[PDB]
Design a protein around this ligand. Structure first.
Ligand SMILES: Nc1ncnc2c1ncn2[C@@H]1O[C@H](COP(=O)(O)OP(=O)(O)OP(=O)(O)O)[C@@H](O)[C@H]1O
Ligand SMILES: Nc1ncnc2c1ncn2[C@@H]1O[C@H](COP(=O)(O)OP(=O)(O)O)[C@@H](O)[C@H]1O
Ligand SMILES: Nc1ncnc2c1ncn2[C@@H]1O[C@H](COP(=O)(O)OP(=O)(O)O)[C@@H](O)[C@H]1O
Ligand SMILES: [Mg+2]
Ligand SMILES: [Mg+2]
Ligand SMILES: [Mg+2]
Ligand SMILES: [Zn+2]
Ligand SMILES: [Zn+2]
Lengths: 649, 163, 430, 46
DNA sequence: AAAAAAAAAAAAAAAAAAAAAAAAA
DNA sequence: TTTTTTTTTTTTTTTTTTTTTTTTT
């Protein structure tokens, strides 16, 4: 239909306007599919059923069926899109006549626009055109209510004025009221006015796409009444919208050039990136595998070789225990805090990052200030929103999740106090400006740290070769002492692992089976939300005798003793292990495994001599579920290492 | 916004900055930190009424002050070059012992310290950055540190690399 | 007609029963007490006349005015006979509450504007009580006539003076205008409801006559109000900052029968034993320690001699032991059981100092008192864990406070002595 | 530690880049290993 | 006892939100 | 006369520097 003088003026005329209207209606009715007969039929049906008041329209099919309309679309998006909305409204009414009571309007969204540009490539030539870009949302305000159909109220004669439709370009100015013909001030009439949601976001170039010697560019976009809340800061989004320019933006103010600000009137948003059913069958299907414990323990941080015990501890921490407060006066936490202390170059931060990735409501912070959110609460005006807000500490943000703390031994005094408070009383008390409040932070703390001097020395007990006071360490349920000891076989294996990773992740090329990560987190969700094991089958006799023996042995030597909190931690870990298997009743094997883990941690926290003392004295407990091959391999490795040391000295 | 070059700075004076203005086509040819030559016209912009004027440069073209190539992917860079430049580059690529030649040429005035020269050369080249399936970023740029007694030509290595 | 709606509200107030008429008697007692306000349960209104409640939910602005007028008339009808000097009837603020579960702040879209909305939150700032005019009088400058009783709209809605009796000849007489209390609060979304990676949203609350200072920053609150925008003489275009008109506030977290219960509980021969075994039942052993903690909880008696000197009556207890014994648990119970109690560590707590501090706001130049655990715990118990790891300033401060019960602070602005009458229960390791 | 393996891989990559080679031959790995070994210095003491 | 690092004070700059007055037509 | 743009003022916050204080050899 190429004809005339101006594209926008061509659509402006009533003739082609109605021609396009009816052609688009016929396209909606007739364009069916290759095989999905009348996609728009079920589309509109679903939209009306959920009351979505929107219609995403692919550009490819619209161009195929009606090439003229698709060509006209990007040149003058406003008029074509308004016509499409008008057409779709009556199409919906024909399909759903009663739906006319709902929103009295339908929005048309267009997706898969062929030509996609970048924020740095925007030019004046793109003014007033439908354009598709990609970017990261760097800021987003609240859902501000914007005037849609105002009804100003004349003061002198108290007569409400008719609906003056609000334009996104200019603020509406009322004339003189028809009744008393007064051009007075007038005021909005909120009760009779109708509004529309108005959100303002900023979209910046993806850092992975910016060139070497260039900085990312940003553009402001306006989401209106249905795209609101479709984005959050940090989202990678494909945005299709109108590169609008003419609202009020012109630096006519002194000391200013005739520049024009630009905002993208958003028309479609697509984020480029868990309440299911019948997956309970899936989770239960492998829950009865009878060896799922090994599978899950091997399915943690698959990019980290070895460190199986650390992976087991992290699994137990993930599934968690059972918080219980007998009466209301004995608060016992159901969490399993974990501390990984080890010499550098052992992938502790890798474990913390994996937990960040795999666990919902999981936040990451560092002892240094290099983390986005700090450990301590405070109140201030947020730098980007300029609004006075109570910045709760990181621990609070992970109220029911996981807080990962890297560089646990490099915190501030106030950071140490805050972590102590959170770990002890499971809450934070703020009295900073005038906010005398106490908000609870029931987080599981997974911490990573290096030993004093950069190397862990087994000749010294754990509590003394770490820059942490005894009270802090006393609140961790598992202590993992990661040691980097020279071992040719393990060194070769790890070298092969990492070098193969490097090979496989080159830009050009871009004893059980671990569960897929998505299914692993589904399993974690279901177990952590549904099964609540009760320890009605624990053998009090065995636990009591074990505790008494450990007390006697630890006090027989000048070593850190065993205390009640160790029994508490063993109970929590047994409950967590039961939760992994969804037993709903802690079983003898669960208790034995929890004892194994707790004794391993407690023994490894001891000095070198006491290490062997307690190993030999309690080897039976520490060998539970540890087959003969593992112990034999460990002993052979010890013997050959002794031989090597004798050789090379 | 630009500022005066170091060579032009008179004794004991801060650099001068005059905000140049770019228009269509040549609207992003200059990036922060680049040494650029701007060709155009000096103009006055106003900042009963008062005539307060400020000088501002309006540039009709922007080009690098010291062009690298006389003429981003490997082939694109290759075509960016002239015939003679590519002849030189290909010749040195086939030049056996190019390692020592680069070491000597890059640091002619620094005696010995072959290891540090090799380190900074490999630094100038660097590794290959990579991205993991989980999204982890594999660092592909090598850093270097130099520690030792004074007058060991450390700041000289830094200045060589900078210049 | 609106008169019919007000009549129906009058009938609901006068004749709603439960027998006893709750609201009639509530009006009687409140007006006699001078409260001049009532708390109307939304569900009772809906049950008695569901149309009224639906109207309130759809058009709160004028229906609440009708309800207030009806309540005023009913109060007059129930308490008209008054002594000379106060017979003038008093308007009545009508707070309304309901059991409906609150709606998350994220659901306050544009559509809910001007509807009655119930949302939860945490108040992070409260402004001082001020004066807003409900009835103003304007006097012409030229003719000096008066236009008394110019009705003023509630909420953040100013008013434009008349232009014609010169032009704009009117000025406001402060001495003749009636005003009421006024306050603005900042409500943040509850941190639990905030999505994982997401900023907390905000809202601005506007209180009224008797709602002012019913909350203090830090309270966890449920607010039922009218979602409203500012109305002040009319790249974002046509955006009017939105706020909530507070109508009902619920702050989340002794009868004579209970007094007699306490009397008989004390009279028991073994009251001491039952109290001793009734503090840390979960914790095993340490009967003497539990008895001592009960004694600390009840405290001695403060004595002020005729010379004015004071003898503290609050017991201070210390517990040194190995880190195995349940003593931090004991402190947690004590802070959970004492009438006024606060748990803290030796180095204060998380963004909550131990002892009070005084700083002068360089801009407003006031004397801001940032209260530590001690002053907050006045008249109660402070449970200090890791009591051996204080800081020198705090060590001296507690040195003074535990004996004198007062913290003396003198800054570049002023000298003062905050009253910290707290019983200290300290835990420590060797 | 393993970070030295990362450094060795990166140095081999840079060595390959120097000659504009497309695959890291063993000679580049040998040169990177030699340089990194020299960078390590023994802590002599009386 | 003296130096190195950290914390707090204090002063200057910026945003900005709103009320009032002078200049323009 | 009536609007409008500016003018201020009145708060508040933020950033740099300096000074003061705390910890270590
Ligand atoms: N067991 C392992 N399996 C796989 N890769 C490993 C393993 N141990 C170390 N690496 C790799 O070696 C490098 C060093 O690990 P990483 O950077 O996580 O150190 P770290 O333990 O966090 O040290 P630090 O305490 O210094 O922060 C990483 O590239 C990591 O992928
Ligand atoms: N091996 C060397 N060969 C050539 N010049 C050297 C050498 N070592 C030191 N110098 C000279 O010594 C001067 C001072 O060295 P400099 O780099 O300032 O010491 P530092 O590393 O302590 O800063 C330099 O100007 C440099 O020319
Ligand atoms: N006598 C006891 N009765 C009941 N529980 C105890 C007893 N002693 C210790 N515990 C348990 O041991 C754990 C350690 O107690 P805690 O008060 O944290 O020690 P500390 O005060 O040294 O930190 C607590 O969780 C507590 O439940
Ligand atoms: Mg690390
Ligand atoms: Mg130097
Ligand atoms: Mg303790
Ligand atoms: Zn009128
Ligand atoms: Zn008059």
């Amino acid at each position: 239909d190429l004809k005339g003088h101006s594209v926008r003026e061509w659509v402006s005329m009533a003739g082609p306007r109605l021609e396009i209207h009816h052609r688009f209606k016929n396209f909606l009715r007739t364009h069916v599919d290759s095989h999905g007969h009348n996609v728009f039929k079920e589309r509109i049906s679903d939209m009306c059923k959920e009351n979505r008041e929107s219609l995403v329209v692919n550009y490819e099919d619209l161009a195929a069926r009606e090439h003229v309309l698709a060509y006209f679309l990007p040149e003058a998006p406003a008029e074509l899109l308004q016509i499409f909305d008008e057409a779709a409204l009556e199409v919906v009414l024909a399909m759903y006549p009663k739906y006319d009571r709902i929103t009295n309007h339908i929005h048309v969204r267009i997706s898969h626009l062929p030509l996609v540009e970048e924020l740095r490539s925007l030019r004046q030539l793109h003014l007033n055109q439908l354009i598709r870009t990609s970017g990261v949302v760097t800021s987003c305000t609240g859902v501000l209510p914007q005037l849609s159909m105002v009804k100003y109220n004349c003061n002198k004669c108290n007569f409400v004025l008719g609906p003056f439709c609000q334009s996104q370009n200019q603020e509406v100015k009322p004339g003189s009221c028809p009744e008393c013909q007064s051009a007075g001030p007038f005021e909005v009439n909120m009760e009779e006015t109708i509004y529309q949601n108005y959100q303002r976001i900023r979209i910046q170039e993806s850092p992975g796409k910016v060139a070497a010697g260039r900085l990312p560019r940003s553009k402001d976009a306006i989401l209106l009444a249905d795209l609101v809340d479709s984005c959050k800061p940090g989202d990678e989004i494909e945005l299709t919208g109108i590169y609008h320019n003419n609202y009020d933006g012109s630096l006519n103010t002194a000391n200013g050039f005739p520049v024009f600000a630009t905002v993208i009137l958003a028309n479609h948003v697509a984020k480029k990136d868990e309440l299911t059913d019948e997956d309970v069958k899936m989770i239960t299907s492998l829950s009865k595998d009878q060896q799922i414990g090994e599978k899950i323990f091997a399915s943690i941080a698959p990019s980290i070789y070895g460190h199986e015990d650390i992976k087991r501890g992290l699994a137990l921490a993930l599934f968690g225990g059972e918080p219980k407060n007998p009466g209301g006066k004995h608060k016992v936490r159901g969490d399993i805090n974990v501390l990984l202390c080890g010499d550098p170059g052992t992938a502790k931060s890798q474990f913390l990052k994996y937990i960040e990735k795999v666990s919902s409501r999981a936040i990451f912070t560092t002892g240094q200030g290099a983390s986005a959110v700090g450990l301590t609460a405070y109140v201030q005006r947020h730098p980007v929103s300029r609004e006075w807000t109570l910045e709760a500490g990181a621990l609070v943000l992970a109220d029911r999740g996981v807080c990962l703390i890297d560089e646990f031994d490099k915190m501030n005094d106030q950071d140490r106090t805050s972590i102590h408070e959170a770990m002890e009383q499971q809450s934070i008390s703020i009295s900073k400006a005038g906010i005398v409040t106490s908000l609870q932070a029931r987080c599981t703390v997974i911490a990573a740290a290096n030993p004093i001097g950069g190397r862990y020395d087994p000749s010294l007990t754990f509590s003394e070769n770490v820059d942490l006071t005894e009270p802090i360490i006393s609140r961790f349920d598992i202590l993992c002492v990661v040691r980097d000891t020279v071992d040719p076989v393990q060194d070769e294996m790890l070298a092969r692992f990492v070098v193969g990773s490097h090979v496989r992740h080159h830009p050009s090329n871009k004893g059980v089976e671990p569960l897929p990560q998505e299914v692993l987190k589904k399993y974690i969700i279901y177990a952590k939300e549904r099964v609540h094991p009760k320890l009605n089958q624990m053998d009090q006799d065995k636990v009591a005798k074990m505790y008494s023996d450990l007390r006697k042995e630890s006090m027989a030597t000048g070593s850190i003793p065993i205390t009640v909190r160790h029994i508490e931690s063993m109970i929590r870990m047994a409950e967590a292990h039961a939760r992994i298997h969804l037993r709903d009743y802690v079983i003898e094997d669960d208790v034995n495994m929890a004892i194994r883990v707790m004794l391993e941690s407690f023994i490894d926290t001891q000095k070198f001599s006491v290490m062997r003392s307690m190993r030999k004295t309690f080897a039976r407990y520490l060998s539970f579920r540890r087959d003969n091959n593992e112990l034999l391999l460990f002993i052979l490795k010890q013997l050959v290492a002794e031989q090597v040391t004798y050789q090379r000295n | 916004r630009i500022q005066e070059t170091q060579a032009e700075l008179p004794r004991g004076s801060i650099p001068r900055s005059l905000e140049v203005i770019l228009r269509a086509e040549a609207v992003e040819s200059a990036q922060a930190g680049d040494k650029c030559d701007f060709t155009g016209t000096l103009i006055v912009v106003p900042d009963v009424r008062d005539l307060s004027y400020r000088l501002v440069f309006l540039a009709c073209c922007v080009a690098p002050t010291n062009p690298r190539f006389g003429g981003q992917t490997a082939e694109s860079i290759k075509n960016q070059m002239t015939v003679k430049e590519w002849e030189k580059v290909f010749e040195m690529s086939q030049d056996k012992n190019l390692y020592h030649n680069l070491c000597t040429s890059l640091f002619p005035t620094i005696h010995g310290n072959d290891e540090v020269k090799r380190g900074v050369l490999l630094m100038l080249f660097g590794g290959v950055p990579k991205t993991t399936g989980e999204g982890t970023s594999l660092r592909g740029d090598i850093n270097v540190c130099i520690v030792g007694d004074p007058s060991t030509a450390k700041s000289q290595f830094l200045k060589h690399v900078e210049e | 007609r609106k008169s019919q709606l007000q009549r129906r509200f009058k009938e609901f107030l006068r004749q709603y029963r439960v027998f006893t008429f709750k609201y009639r008697d509530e009006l009687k007692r409140h007006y006699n007490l001078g409260e001049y306000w009532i708390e109307v349960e939304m569900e009772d209104l809906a049950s008695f006349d569901e149309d009224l409640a639906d109207y309130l939910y759809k058009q709160p602005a004028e229906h609440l005015q009708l309800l207030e007028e009806a309540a005023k008339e009913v109060a007059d009808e129930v308490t008209r006979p008054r002594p000379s000097g106060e017979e003038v009837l008093q308007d009545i603020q009508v707070m309304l509450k309901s059991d409906a579960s609150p709606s998350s702040i994220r659901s306050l879209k544009s559509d809910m504007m001007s509807h009655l909305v119930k949302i939860p939150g945490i108040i992070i700032a409260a402004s001082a009580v001020r004066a807003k005019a409900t009835r103003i009088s304007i006097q012409c400058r030229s003719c000096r006539n008066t236009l008394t009783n110019i009705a003023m709209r509630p909420g953040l809605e100013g008013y434009a003076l008349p232009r014609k009796c010169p032009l704009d000849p009117y000025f406001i007489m402060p001495d003749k205008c009636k005003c009421v209390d006024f306050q603005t609060l900042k409500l943040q979304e509850l941190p639990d409801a905030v999505p994982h990676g997401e900023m907390p949203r905000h809202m601005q609350l506007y209180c009224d006559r008797y709602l002012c200072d019913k909350v203090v920053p830090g309270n966890r609150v449920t607010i039922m109000g009218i979602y409203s925008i500012k109305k002040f003489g009319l790249v974002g275009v046509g955006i009017r900052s939105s706020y909530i008109r507070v109508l009902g506030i619920q702050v989340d977290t002794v009868s004579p029968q209970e007094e007699e219960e306490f009397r008989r509980l004390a009279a028991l021969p073994n009251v001491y034993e039952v109290i001793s075994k009734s503090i840390a039942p979960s914790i095993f052993g340490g009967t003497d320690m539990k008895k001592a903690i009960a004694c600390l909880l009840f405290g001695g008696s403060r004595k002020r001699l005729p010379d004015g000197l004071t003898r503290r009556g609050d017991i201070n207890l210390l517990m040194l032991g190995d880190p195995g014994t349940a003593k931090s648990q004991l402190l947690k119970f004590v802070e959970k059981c004492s009438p006024i109690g606060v748990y803290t560590s030796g180095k204060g707590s998380s963004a909550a100092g131990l002892t009070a501090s005084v700083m002068r706001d360089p801009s407003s130049r006031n004397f801001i008192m940032e209260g530590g655990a001690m002053v907050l715990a006045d008249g109660g118990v402070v449970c200090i864990d890791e009591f051996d790891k204080m800081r020198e300033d705090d060590r001296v401060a507690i040195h003074e406070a535990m004996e004198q019960q007062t913290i003396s602070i003198a800054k570049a602005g002023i000298t003062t002595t905050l009253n910290s009458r707290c019983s200290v229960l300290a835990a420590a390791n060797s | 530690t393993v970070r030295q393996l990362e450094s060795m891989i990166r140095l081999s990559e840079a060595m390959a880049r120097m000659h504009c080679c497309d695959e890291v031959q063993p000679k580049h790995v040998k040169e990177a290993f030699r340089l990194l070994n020299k960078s390590i210095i023994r802590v002599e003491t009386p």
